Write a protein that binds this ligand. Sequence first.
Ligand SMILES: *[C@@H]1O[C@H](CO)[C@@H](O[C@@H]2O[C@H](CO)[C@@H](O)[C@H](O)[C@H]2NC(C)=O)[C@H](O)[C@H]1NC(C)=O
Ligand SMILES: *[C@@H]1O[C@H](CO)[C@@H](O)[C@H](O)[C@H]1NC(C)=O
Ligand SMILES: *[C@@H]1O[C@H](CO)[C@@H](O)[C@H](O)[C@H]1NC(C)=O
Ligand SMILES: *[C@@H]1O[C@H](CO)[C@@H](O)[C@H](O)[C@H]1NC(C)=O
Ligand SMILES: *[C@@H]1O[C@H](CO)[C@@H](O)[C@H](O)[C@H]1NC(C)=O
Lengths: 82, 49, 94, 46, 98, 49, 37, 113, 50, 49
Amino acid sequence: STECSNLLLQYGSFCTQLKRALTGIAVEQDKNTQEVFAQVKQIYKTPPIKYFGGFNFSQILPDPSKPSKRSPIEDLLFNKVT
Amino acid sequence: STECSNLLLQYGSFCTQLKRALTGIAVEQDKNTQEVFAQVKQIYKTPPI
Amino acid sequence: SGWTAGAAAYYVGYLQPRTFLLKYNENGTITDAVDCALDPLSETKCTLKSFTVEKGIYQTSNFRVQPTESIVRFPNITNLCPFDEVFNATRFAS
Amino acid sequence: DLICAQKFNGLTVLPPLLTDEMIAQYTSALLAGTITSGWTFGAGPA
Amino acid sequence: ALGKLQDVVNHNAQALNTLVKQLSSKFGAISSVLNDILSRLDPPEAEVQIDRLITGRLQSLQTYVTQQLIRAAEIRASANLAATKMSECVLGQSKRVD
Amino acid sequence: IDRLITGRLQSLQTYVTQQLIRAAEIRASANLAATKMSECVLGQSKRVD
Amino acid sequence: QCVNLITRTQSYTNSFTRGVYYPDKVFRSSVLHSTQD
Amino acid sequence: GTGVLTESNKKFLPFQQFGRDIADTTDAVRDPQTLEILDITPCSFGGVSVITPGTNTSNQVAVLYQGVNCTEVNVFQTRAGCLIGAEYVNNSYECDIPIGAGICASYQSIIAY
Amino acid sequence: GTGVLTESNKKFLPFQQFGRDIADTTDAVRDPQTLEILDITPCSFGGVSV
Amino acid sequence: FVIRGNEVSQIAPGQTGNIADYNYKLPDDFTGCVIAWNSNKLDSKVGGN
Ligand SMILES: *[C@@H]1O[C@H](CO)[C@@H](O[C@@H]2O[C@H](CO)[C@@H](O)[C@H](O)[C@H]2NC(C)=O)[C@H](O)[C@H]1NC(C)=O
Ligand SMILES: *[C@@H]1O[C@H](CO)[C@@H](O)[C@H](O)[C@H]1NC(C)=O
Ligand SMILES: *[C@@H]1O[C@H](CO)[C@@H](O)[C@H](O)[C@H]1NC(C)=O
Ligand SMILES: *[C@@H]1O[C@H](CO)[C@@H](O)[C@H](O)[C@H]1NC(C)=O
Ligand SMILES: *[C@@H]1O[C@H](CO)[C@@H](O)[C@H](O)[C@H]1NC(C)=O
């Protein structure tokens, strides 16, 4: 409705304020993910032979068979959150 | 006033939103007390001497 | 005895203004409903907008005792009020 | 009469889930574990 | 066990659903549909009816944005805590109790 | 009645908004207090002040 | 020709969950709709 | 207005007719027919909380009238309010459904402890 | 309204005409001339970012 | 101009009518005054003006 937008123009910069606040929230979410996860500038890889003195990390290391390259625990976490 | 509540029904789910926010605050206060004080699941006792 | 003897059985109920919560299935038929006022649990179902209510304590409504009768208290003095002197006057002022 | 005036207009104060004596019992347990066992009760058995 | 993340998702979905539900509110006007108010009314009080709908929808949108800002502050505090735990528990061994 | 409803609704939403902001402040203080309970009472802290 | 032939007795019973009708003419699928009517 | 009309100990001056509280709501009234001061109080009311387990588990419920004495509404009196439909058990358990003021409820019927 | 009217796989009951979403937004309608169901999808939109 | 007695309500912003659509249309943001007075002595004739 164009005359509704003409009436909405009389109320000023309310829509600009709401859009700016939501843009700040949207960039803050990506920022928060950057301080949580992007803490190293080098992408490290485990050796092909995964023997660590008897310590087993297969449930937390990535699964090469899965296309998502996620750990079994991470795959369970992703399946249990909808 | 019944007709005032009938007119209040036309404003939508504002009252439900306010009640939900206050219920969240109310359970948040009890959660705060649980995090501060309920840090042990054993009630230890001082010896009598 | 000019007419054949017969019987008819029928139920009559009356409608009150009530809030209901209706469940629409995937074909669009109302399959189930809850009346809000009649049952506390059903009032919780109406508040949560769901037929399955999880374990917990839920703020639903407010109890209030209704007024029983109306009392009107006016002054006991009764005097016929002279509106006839105002509106039926033959001459008014400038 | 402030509390009655708040209550009559629909503003109620819910009590805390833990009473003051239960919070005091929590602090007494923390005192007893700290004095009798040090920092060991916070990391396992006292 | 995974309630917290699910709660975050639920809160976001619930807020968005509530905001769409606020488009069905008359807000004391004759209808919640702008085109109906156009069709059954001449302009000079239809201006008032549409103005009532506009101020109701602004109230709903500002309520949503304020709730989103408060939830964003809470989630930012949780994420700052998560970054601190990533630095101090994963990238090192911590002497901080619990 | 509609003017009274919109005034009282705006007052109630204002109250709930300040209550949410104060609840965020008190939650931050209670998280700090839980951290001090864990790190000063349940252990010895080398963090300065 | 108004003639009286019908007598009537009555009892009282429970409505159970009968008497619910469609409040409008709107298709709705797999939802929960609350109405005052 | 709606309420209960009781005796008042408020010493109204002869010119004064109405009484108001800190809230500026009508608290006392002078009747015109007999010149007596009636204290107006709102009728009894409170919040209603429904304590339930899951509907997968059971359909039994308990009702908490918040801030309401049990004489003005399995009846138990708590600081949180009056609890109807739950029996008090002297045994102490972990909290399942929080009622308040140290009182919780659980399903085993619905008990309060 | 304004929108495309695509084919619908929803089987209406014959007294119903209009259809609504979970958030009471109209998503379907029956056609009065020919008793068929049409899915109303209001027209394509987007945020333009530069 | 000169109009009929029932048409004086149509000289207004946002009005629907015969002379409002086909003779004299006022804008929605109209600012000003409307003045109406009778003219039987000058604008009427016994045979029909
Ligand atoms: C490390 O852990 C994995 C998973 O716990 C072990 O893989 C299991 O091996 C047993 C016996 O070979 C199988 O019955 C299971 O089905 C395996 N589970 C999975 C998820 O693959 C693995 O054997 C452990 N040890 C090493 C050296 O990798
Ligand atoms: C819904 O419609 C389908 C297809 O017509 C039918 O098979 C089914 O029995 C109906 N009822 C339910 C409850 O799914
Ligand atoms: C009003 O005055 C007229 C004379 O002017 C008189 O006939 C009539 O009865 C009066 N009505 C009343 C109600 O006094
Ligand atoms: C009538 O009201 C007056 C006050 O206006 C009071 O003085 C008087 O006693 C009342 N009469 C009776 C019979 O109650
Ligand atoms: C309406 O007209 C159409 C066009 O021929 C026809 O197919 C249809 O049967 C008519 N009746 C109804 C009830 O739609």
